[model samples]
Structure formats: C-alpha cells, structure tokens
Target: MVDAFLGTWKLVDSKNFDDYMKSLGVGFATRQVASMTKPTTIIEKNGDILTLKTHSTFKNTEISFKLGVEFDETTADDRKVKSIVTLDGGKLVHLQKWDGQETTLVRELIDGKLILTLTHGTAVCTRTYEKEA
Candidate 1:
C-alpha cells in the first residue's frame, strides 16, 4: 500500500529554524532573518514523478523531477544544487550538492509520522511532518 505521504504534504510548523539553517550551513545573519519568515512545503507525487514547492515570504523554491533521476536544484540563495531521490527499502534517500560536497537526506515514515533527516557539516537535523488528512 502506498503511504499517505505519497501525496502532497505541506509545512505547518517548525520548531527550530535555526537548527535547520545550521544544517544547511547558512550564515548567522541570513539564518536570523530566515528563521522569522514562515516557510511552506508543498509536495505532489504521481507515479514516479515528485514535485516539491517551498514558499516563503522571502523566496519561493520549487523542484520537479522523477524519482531515481538526477537534477539540478537551486535554493533561495541561488546556490548550485544537485539532487537525486531513490527508494532504499521503505525510505526515500536524497543526495544533495553543497559547495562541491555531497550531502545526504533520509526520508521515512515512522509511527504514522513523516520524518526528514539532513546529514551534513557537523549538524544533523530531523524535521517531522504529520499527515494533514
């Protein structure tokens, strides 16, 4: 059976934006400003195609690509980004590019919870999303 998260999901709450910025290795001043801006994440999935739209007052970011394919991704700051999504068992694996370095993200469903993990730099932040059904 496909998971509820297989459909679109939106960002409703964030506990620590600073930690998320730290995981992305964004500068302090930028993080300070970004932390206050509420961000939204909208995801859509059909077959093997997944599109993600993140909207914020400061900037809006959107990604459209099929699973298991590599694509170029750019963030709000226009950073050179690349990423690919693959299914590892039941989890979604994301490989990202940062400063010529490759980063990794793991997406999984646990106890009816959507969990997103980013592993890079010396910081690892896990963001959780509950289904809006």
Candidate 2:
C-alpha cells in the first residue's frame, strides 16, 4: 500500500501527451522516443521536503521542493524551468515556467491510483499510474 504519494508508481495510460510535449517546444525526435517509453515515478517525503523523480528507458528527471516553494528545475528534455508544487484542496498542483512558456500538472490520489493531468497552452494530457506492487 502507498501512503501519500510515497511510493513507486508504474505508468499505465497516457492521452495526448505528445501534443502536450509539442506545445512545450519539445522536438519531434525527442517526443517520439519519449512517447514510446513507459516511465516509473517515485515519490518520497523527507523532513520538510517532497521529492518527485521519474525514469524510463529513454530519460530521467528529479526534483525536490518544499510545498509552495519555487525552485530551479531541469526537465528531462533539458529545459531549465522554475517549478513549484503545492497541496491545494486535497490535490497536488504543480507549475513550471520557462522561456515564456508555462505548464500545469494536477495530481490526484484516488482509489490508490495516481492521476496526472498536464496542460501546456491549448494541449492537455492525462496520465494514470498505479502503485508498484
């Protein structure tokens, strides 16, 4: 069993994520490689910080931030961005900004499943993950 996003999760489903990447200025080749990979997400809490890390056959990324605090982050696609996460209304709201671009990722824990809805400009992607058994 998982406790508060504090476990490893396996990606199961994704929708429109490629378009979302395209809106974020990710190149076609990188997006193609990314689209074919199933990534694993690990969430952990230590002291006053929460960490989110993701890895796959293609690439990996990680970040640690205090709730509601913005920090420098380098995305898997090599974009340098300012990122922040906050717990709001029983959900996790993550925001990232770079190069006049902004994106939002809304995370929810429902029925032991992790649901992530990401938006960039006019494109939105929804991904679902299940806790590692």
RMSD of 1: 2.7
Q: Clashing residue pairs, candidate 1?
A: none
lDDT of 1 at 41: 61
What overall lDDT goes with each candidate model? 0.72, 0.88
Candidate 1: lDDT over CA atoms? Answer: 0.72
- Estimate the TM-score of every prediction: 0.78, 0.93
Candidate 1 lDDT, 16-132, residue by residue in tens = 557757767688988887766755566677777788776778788888888889999876756687888887878878798867876677877888776777666666666776665
Best prediction by TM-score: 2
What's the residue-level lDDT of 87 in candidate 1? 78
Residue runs of model 1 more than 4 Å from their true location after superposition: 1-3, 10-20, 23-25
Worst 10 residues of 2 by lDDT: 1-10
Residue 24 of model 1 has an lDDT of 70
- Give every collision pair in model 2: none
